[PDB]
Write a protein that binds this DNA or RNA. Structure first.
Ligand SMILES: C[C@H]1COc2c(N3CCN(C)CC3)c(F)cc3c(=O)c(C(=O)O)cn1c23
Ligand SMILES: [Mg+2]
Ligand SMILES: [Mg+2]
Lengths: 546, 479
DNA sequence: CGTGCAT
DNA sequence: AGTCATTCATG
């Protein structure tokens, strides 16, 4: 009688429907265990069997979107199954009974054997009929993702999945903080995991927050152990808490300039879970997908806005830096509505790298060979202006200089903040020739004269093999001896450039360190200064002509 | 992963690296042949390729590409511009490259790109390379370790002073102006005879620079100062006539301007003087230079003080400039401000060259004389030599048998045994004539080697030939 | 100011 | 196939 309008009970599909009654049965047996081990099995047959650690018919009842013999009149599976065999072990016996198609009983429920003492357990195995279903092929990947994400909020339960076709298996158990890890597994991490607990008049909210270098925000919400896919007032309580708690943190001893919104949520991922007392539980229409209960907004905003006005004040590290990020987000965002170097994909001043490459040509191979997630490319076109000889007028009217002053994002001179920067490492990558040497020299003097902190915090670097098995030393080629000599990177392919000098795994970068500020100041000012005679003599004295 | 170095250390291994290279191998001419590395490679490469004065012009881009791929690991623009410059006869007193097409002008308009033009060495450039095949000069491996290139050319004329050089590196710059070939050679010849010669006396032969652009050079004492020390400021002034136009007006006509001056910029700046009325008098400025003659007309107003106008233009334009000597060259791998060490290094260089050339030819002549001696002998004993080779088991056994049975050396055995059958149809007399000519040839060379004077005579004899072949002063001299 | 090998 | 700018030294 459900067989006739199946979409109403399940939303038939191919095979989102098939994968919907398994959800119904599994969530049902969960619901039953809540009031401690559910095992699912895909068989060689094609059939599916859920079993758990009168439980029986309260079990086979489904269409079951909840949590927190007798019947069998409308078990929406029984109705939608070729055959369905069912079995209970209880009191000291074991009973089995099966049905075909409509759920017309092929036999009566009989004792099919002796059960190990009073030990109890329920099991349903069934094959959907290929009549009312177009796909009978249960996917293990899908069932997996379900059971998985199900098990997080289900602290009381452990559930498993075995595929007897592919002979593979998982099991799931979770003792909300983990969930944010699971959500940010293969991503890069701006802040650690922030976790905020709290009861406040009947309501129990529990949130973890953790940013990434991503763009899309990713916020999951849970009331009473099930998901609010469509958000709700608790979510709005959580979003409204941060946008206004951090604005305060900006405003105060930070940066506001006196005189933002979703910009705070860029790359934010968070799993938010409240406990509502159920007599206050109210959602939208038909489905329990969006929490409507009004008190949830000012209780979540309560608990959260409290804990992380504290957290922000508690450490100006992940704090003021995080705000700056919002304004960089605020910057381009409004510059997109105003839209109506080669940059790193995601903004991460903690691992981002700026490559100043000698030449647009080498700049090309650099763009092609790079890891675009965290590596930016800035081609320098021609010898860089000598920041010692030239005037601070012309020095600031220089394209190469002026766009580094901007791409770096910290300004220049004494009006220069090292915390508003954009990269953890600025890497100078030149040809392995005399002129590359020269270029390294003119850039080093600029960074010393005009961004000394960056060179002082060991942020400025200098990036190739000499021989081909590869070697760098005249000694390393004799160990290989038990041969092509590299004349340039141009003899460099993007593939090779990476393996050899750009990959943080397989590369060597000289790190510039200002050791003795005063004897360092003598060196720059003598090699690069206006006066020729000093230089000439330095050369006459240190340069071995032979 | 990471290794630290000091700011003080980084800027030291780098600027030293660069400084050394720009001084030795870029901006500064070698004191002996007067060429920067890029120019030597240009000349060497075109000569290797037979792209000489006596053969068809060859596409510029072909030449440039070969220079780049074989010798000079830099941009083609730079090579090409260098090649073009060596062909411009208002920059070079004696051009070394002949180029067909737009290769620029005194007005400084861009030369055609190297896809249009074509080029070859000039005849005189041939004399810079004379005897390069005779192991006369030291060779090194190219950037590539694939091929040898010369580190200096044989220079059968004194190109450093003849063509000049300029001239900017690190810690040093250079400015050496051009001189007249016959004059520079007269000086060299005197100095060969009188090594301890003083400048005063040298200047009876070499009175001063000789610009391709001509003009008037004023400053005898600064010329002397520069010939002694390598530094000096001289004045260079346009050749000017005056022409009495009808109706009481005059007109200043310029016909030679100062070296390194862009005609067109000069004409514009002189007209700027007229448009701005900085001084009164100028009626019109008119560049009247055609393809065969330089002529600028500065027409004056009626009742215009022509001396005042002229003098003002001399001071406030490049109608007249100061020219500064700063003769720096590379001597024994290092930069030198230099006249005495320059000439003397050159003389010692030619000595090595001529000595080496002569060892090389003598070596050739001996190897040959040695073989001709064996052949003269073989003929006294053909029938039995053919018999012997007939009886030998193979090439190597035949040679062995010729040594053992008749005392020929390896080298003679090789020659005898690699003769073609038709040679057996052949007279000891022809061979004896050759033996005699070789003995004379070896005596001449061996003397040169054992006694310096014979060699210096050759060098003078050759410098005089070059002079007789390649013109009159262009630039007048004034005290 | 512009020169000439370099970027 | 021109055009744009920079190094370096010098007067
Ligand atoms: C190496 C590249 C670098 O860029 C260059 C120029 N620019 C530098 C940056 N400016 C903002 C715009 C202009 C330039 F004006 C001329 C040349 C040039 O003649 C040249 C060559 O190979 O002969 C090569 N290059 C040039
Ligand atoms: Mg290079
Ligand atoms: Mg250029």
């Amino acid at each position: 009688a459900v067989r006739k309008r199946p979409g109403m009970y399940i939303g038939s599909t191919d095979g989102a429907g098939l994968h919907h009654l398994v959800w119904e049965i599994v969530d049902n047996a969960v619901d039953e265990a809540l009031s401690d081990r559910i095992d699912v099995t895909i068989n060689k047959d094609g059939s599916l069997t859920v079993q758990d650690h009168t439980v029986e018919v309260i079990f086979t009842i489904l269409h079951a979107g909840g949590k927190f013999l007798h019947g069998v009149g409308s078990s929406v599976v029984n109705a939608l199954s070729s055959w369905l065999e069912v079995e209970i072990t209880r009191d000291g016996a074991v009973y089995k009974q099966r049905f075909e198609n409509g759920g017309k009983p092929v036999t009566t429920l009989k004792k099919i054997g002796t059960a190990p003492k009073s030990k109890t357990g329920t099991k349903v195995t069934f094959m959907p009929d290929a009549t009312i279903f177009s796909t009978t092929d249960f996917k293990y990947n899908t069932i997996s993702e379900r059971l998985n994400e199900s098990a997080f909020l289900l602290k009381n339960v452990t559930l498993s999945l075995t595929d007897k076709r592919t002979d593979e298996a998982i099991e799931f158990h979770y003792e909300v903080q983990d969930f944010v890890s699971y959500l940010n597994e293969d991503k890069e991490i701006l802040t650690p995991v922030l976790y905020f607990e709290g009861e406040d008049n009947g309501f129990q909210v529990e949130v973890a927050l953790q940013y990434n270098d991503g763009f899309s925000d990713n916020i999951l919400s849970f009331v009473n152990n099930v998901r609010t896919k469509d958000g709700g007032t608790h979510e709005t309580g959580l979003k409204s808490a941060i946008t206004k708690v951090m604005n305060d943190y900006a405003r105060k001893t930070g940066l506001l300039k006196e005189k933002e919104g979703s910009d705070y949520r860029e790359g934010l991922a968070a799993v938010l879970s409240i406990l509502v007392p159920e007599e206050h539980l109210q959602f939208e229409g038909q489905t329990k997908d969006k929490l409507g209960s009004p008190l949830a907004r000012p209780v979540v905003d309560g608990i959260v806005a409290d804990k992380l006005t504290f957290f922000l004040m508690e450490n100006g590290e992940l704090a003021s830096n995080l705000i700056r990020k919002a304004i960089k987000a605020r910057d381009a965002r409004e510059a997109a509505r105003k839209a109506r170097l080669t940059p790193a994909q995601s903004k991460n001043p903690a691992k981002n790298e700026l490559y100043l490459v000698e030449g647009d040509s080498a700049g090309g191979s650099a763009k092609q060979g790079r890891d675009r997630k965290f590596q930016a490319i800035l081609p320098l076109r021609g010898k860089v202006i000598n920041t010692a000889k030239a005037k601070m007028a012309d020095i600031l009217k220089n394209e190469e200089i002026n766009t580094m002053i901007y791409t770096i994002g910290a300004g220049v001179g004494a009006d220069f903040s090292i915390e508003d920067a954009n990269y953890d490492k600025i890497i100078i990558m030149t040809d392995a020739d005399t002129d590359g040497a020269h270029i390294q020299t003119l850039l080093l003097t600029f960074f010393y004269r005009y961004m000394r902190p960056l060179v002082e915090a060991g942020h400025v670097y200098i990036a190739p093999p000499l021989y081909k098995a590869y070697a760098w030393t005249d000694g390393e080629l004799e160990e290989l001896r038990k041969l092509q000599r590299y004349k340039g990177l141009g003899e460099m392919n993007a593939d090779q450039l990476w393996e050899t000098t750009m990959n943080p795994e397989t590369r060597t970068l000289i790190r510039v360190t200002i050791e003795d500020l005063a004897r360092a100041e003598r060196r720059v000012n003598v090699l690069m200064g206006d006066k020729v005679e000093p230089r000439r003599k330095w050369i006459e004295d240190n340069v071995k002509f032979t | 992963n990471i290794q630290n170095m000091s700011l003080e250390d980084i800027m030291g291994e780098r600027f030293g690296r660069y400084s050394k290279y720009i001084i030795q191998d870029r901006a500064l001419p070698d004191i002996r042949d007067g060429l920067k590395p890029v120019q030597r490679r240009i000349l060497y490469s075109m000569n290797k390729d037979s792209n000489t004065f006596d053969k068809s012009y060859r596409k510029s881009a072909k030449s440039v590409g070969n220079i780049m791929g074989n010798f000079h690991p830099h941009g083609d623009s730079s090579i090409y511009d260098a090649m073009v410059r060596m062909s411009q006869n208002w920059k070079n007193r004696e051009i070394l490259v002949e180029m067909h097409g737009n290769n620029g002008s005194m007005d400084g308009d861009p030369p055609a790109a190297m896809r249009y033009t074509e080029a070859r060495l000039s005849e005189i450039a041939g004399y810079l390379l004379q005897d390069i095949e005779k192991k006369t000069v030291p060779f090194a491996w190219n950037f590539d370790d694939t091929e040898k290139e010369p580190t200096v050319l044989p220079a059968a004329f004194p190109n450093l002073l003849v063509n000049g050089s300029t001239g900017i590196s690190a810690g040093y710059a250079t400015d050496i102006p051009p001189h007249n070939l016959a004059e520079v050679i007269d000086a060299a010849v005197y100095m060969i005879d009188h090594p301890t010669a003083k400048i005063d006396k040298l200047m009876e032969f070499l009175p001063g620079p000789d610009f391709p652009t001509g003009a008037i050079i004023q400053g005898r004492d600064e010329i002397k100062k520069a010939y002694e020390t390598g530094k000096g400021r001289v004045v260079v002034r346009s050749k000017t006539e005056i022409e009495k136009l009808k109706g009481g007006k005059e007109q200043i006509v310029i016909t030679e301007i100062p070296y390194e001056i862009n005609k067109a910029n000069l004409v514009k700046k002189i007209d700027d003087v007229r448009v701005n009325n900085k001084v009164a008098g100028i009626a019109e400025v008119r560049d009247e230079s055609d393809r065969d003659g330089l002529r600028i007309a500065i027409e004056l107003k009626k009742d215009a003080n022509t001396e005042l106008v002229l003098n003002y233009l001399f001071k406030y334009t490049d109608l007249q400039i100061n020219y500064n000597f700063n003769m720096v060259a590379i001597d024994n791998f290092t930069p030198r401000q230099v006249i005495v060490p320059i000439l003397s290094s050159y003389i010692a260089h030619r000595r090595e060259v001529i000595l080496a050339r002569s060892r090389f030819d003598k070596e050739k002549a001996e190897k040959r004389l040695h073989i001709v001696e064996g052949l003269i002998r073989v003929i006294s004993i053909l029938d039995e030599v053919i018999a012997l080779i007939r009886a030998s088991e193979n090439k190597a056994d035949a040679k062995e048998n010729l040594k053992v049975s008749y005392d020929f050396t390896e080298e003679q055995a090789e020659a005898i045994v690699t003769l073609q059958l038709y040679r057996l149809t052949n007279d000891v007399v022809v061979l004896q004539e050759e033996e005699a000519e070789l003995r004379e040839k070896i005596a001449m060379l061996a003397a040169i080697i054992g006694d310096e004077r014979t060699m210096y005579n050759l060098m003078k004899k050759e410098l005089r030939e070059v002079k007789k072949k390649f013109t009159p002063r262009l630039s007048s001299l004034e005290d």
